[PDB]
Symmetry: D2
């Protein structure tokens, strides 16, 4: 087991990637705290794997704070954190309402800052550790996603800065950049659009949440002890070359 007795907290743990990550980490022997917005599915997901459920709204500074206090009270320490909690509000920029722009930045960018800052305080000067922040292949720009791309590009920048500041404290910070992963949130994607995303993917298929989880496992485990400030794309090569269409 790669996370034997490691205390890890995971956000957005109730669905898709967060869920698959919670399961993989549990099999790897981690002492977990599952966080998400909705208590109902949070408890179900957490119980199915033996983790401790803690409702958290990564968008609410107070919520993130209370959550980490509970997690620390329950775990006693923090060895790593994988942050997922993210949303989208697609629209070409000229039809994008300010409210939609500010909501995704608040949730994805500031939310990552709040969770990361909390993760840092729980570890800095206490023990070495590893923080994994999730951005997206889209941070490089993508049609109809100026807000998503800006917020996730911001997360990459945050990661590199945090990595610079925490390095001497044995704390690593890296960011995942998944591509088109099949989850409940992508079920709505139209078939003519799916055919198009897959065509721009050298590996010719959609990704599976377990695959993102493994990337997370690697970054959080001691096997990546000499890797920090990095952006790991898990998009099947979707970003090697630019996607037309």
């Amino acid at each position: 087991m790669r996370l034997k007795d490691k205390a890890v907290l995971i956000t957005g743990a109730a669905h898709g990637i967060g869920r698959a990550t919670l399961e993989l980490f549990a099999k790897e022997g981690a002492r977990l705290v599952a966080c998400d917005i909705e208590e109902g599915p949070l408890r179900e997901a957490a119980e199915a794997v033996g983790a401790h459920p803690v409702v958290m709204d990564v968008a609410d500074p107070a919520s993130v704070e209370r959550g980490f206090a509970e997690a620390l009270a329950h775990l006693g320490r923090l060895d790593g954190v994988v942050h997922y909690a993210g949303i989208t509000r697609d629209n070409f920029h000229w039809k994008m309402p300010l409210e939609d722009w500010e909501l995704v930045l608040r949730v994805n960018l500031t939310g990552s800052f709040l969770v990361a800052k909390a993760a840092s305080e729980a570890m800095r000067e206490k023990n070495p550790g590893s923080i994994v922040l999730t951005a997206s292949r889209v941070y490089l720009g993508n049609l109809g996603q100026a807000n998503y791309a800006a917020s996730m590009a911001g997360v990459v920048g945050l990661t590199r800065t945090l990595a610079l500041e925490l390095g001497r404290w044995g704390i690593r910070v890296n960011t995942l950049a998944p591509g088109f992963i099949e989850t409940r949130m992508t079920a709505k994607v139209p078939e003519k659009v799916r055919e198009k995303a897959i065509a721009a993917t050298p590996l010719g298929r959609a990704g599976k949440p377990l695959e993102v989880a493994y990337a997370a496992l690697f970054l959080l485990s001691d096997e990546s002890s000499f890797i920090t400030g990095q952006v790991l794309f898990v998009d099947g090569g979707r970003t090697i070359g630019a996607a037309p269409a």
Copy 2:
């Protein structure tokens, strides 16, 4: 002249870089609209160049909106925009108050969004054009600047996305990433030491990069990050 009759609006036009850009563009024959927060220094910088002063708080949606209306009413068209307006609130993350984090994002990232969105609105399907957003070499991460780096990194992401959505309309979107520009003591030596060209940059030099990006000489260039940092970023993984 490279901006002969071109209608250009410039933000942060009262300060160093913006001011230097107003002067250059004026010499290049542009019909300018100067924008900034403080009327006093704005009016003066605009008058010395023959530009039309328009007070603007890029952090305020309504101000940006009224601003562009005045610019359009005065120019009749918009051919390019160079957005500078930016701020910092340094601190190691563990000492960085949320308020500080949200202010720089609001002013730097959301401000760039409001300005670019208005610029686009004035040009899309009307005429080709060029938009230049100013980021910073720090978007690659820098000690004590999590908020600044994240916001500028967002600007780079915004510019790329904008470049993709506007390309078919003949509108180019590019981003300037200045390094260490003149107007501090031991902070200077370390900076210059990490600079291959061995010196601080001058606002004029950043203005020239803006001139290039906005003129028709960069007509086939869009979605790019142009570092004007004296090579301070060579050797660092690009983002």
Copy 3:
């Protein structure tokens, strides 16, 4: 005139991009030396502009050396160099003969080293200056171009190292990365190819040699005096979305 009386040497000056650059640089007041492999078309292109023709095989160490001695004898100094000489030998890697791989590397990568080295020797410790090497948007990887991509990616790496070593000598080194430029080796490219590239280009058109020439003018003139070690893409946004390198 941004190149008033500046001594400039251009390789591949007889071909599309180089020719347009000779013409623009001539208008900008530069004292030019035009280099290329075939004497006939070189003399024609040089004369049409008032440049001094010097036949050169950028792949031959001695040819490059002789060429630069002529250049210096005629110019007396070197203010800048713009290098364009390059070749392609497409094929999926499994059908690529070693010979084709070694040729494009020798010409494109080693050829840039030879020219950059000569240019540097002519300026280092004598006067500040600007050197512009031409890579390609394809350095980021492209179907059927393992050799071209590898060689052009090497040029970017070469540029970056050279900018670090020459920085203190007031000598700047930058790379141009042109996209689909309408010249002659493209005039009759099969219509489905021309269509492919344009669909992947946000500005929706092929680039013109003159446009690459202006980027060269910018980088070489005193207007980019504080810019070095950079990769300037001139591909109409065709690379937007691809993970940077």
Copy 4:
């Protein structure tokens, strides 16, 4: 075990990073073929782990070819390859002799092309697989290393091209970019350099070959099944800000 029954070939397996990878991959249950230039230390490193030694000069087309024929005769299939074999010839460009420039490219850049080409040929249309080529953080430019920087940057471009071409065949191609790794080569490096290297490393120390080995394990195993065309830096953050 992460590489159970996986048939893998590793170059430069006799020393440092390659040897560490060989050892790790053996514990992970891989059926290995160790390749390196010197038979003496090659057989030793391979025998100590149960790998099959095959002498190979990555700079020689025929040598690489015979090597893979032996590897295949012994393995019967190829599931992955980790290429390390590289060299340096430092010097500021004005003092860098052509021969030194051509040797590092031939060995590092062409060498990788030869090994990746043989690896691809053994897998394309036969089975999905993973190819890991080793570049270096220096691919981004470094004082006194024009030739090394260019060769490694070329490997990054090669990796990306290969990834695009082999994706449809279920074959992934990724590249490692190690930083300052504590080896029996960096030991002699003058303290001037050491202090300068460690100082520019957020993690404040040199890397160990095992750490680079783990990165290779990840990229070669099915754990990175949806990752291709990537450059994974294993430099302790040295490349974050230069």
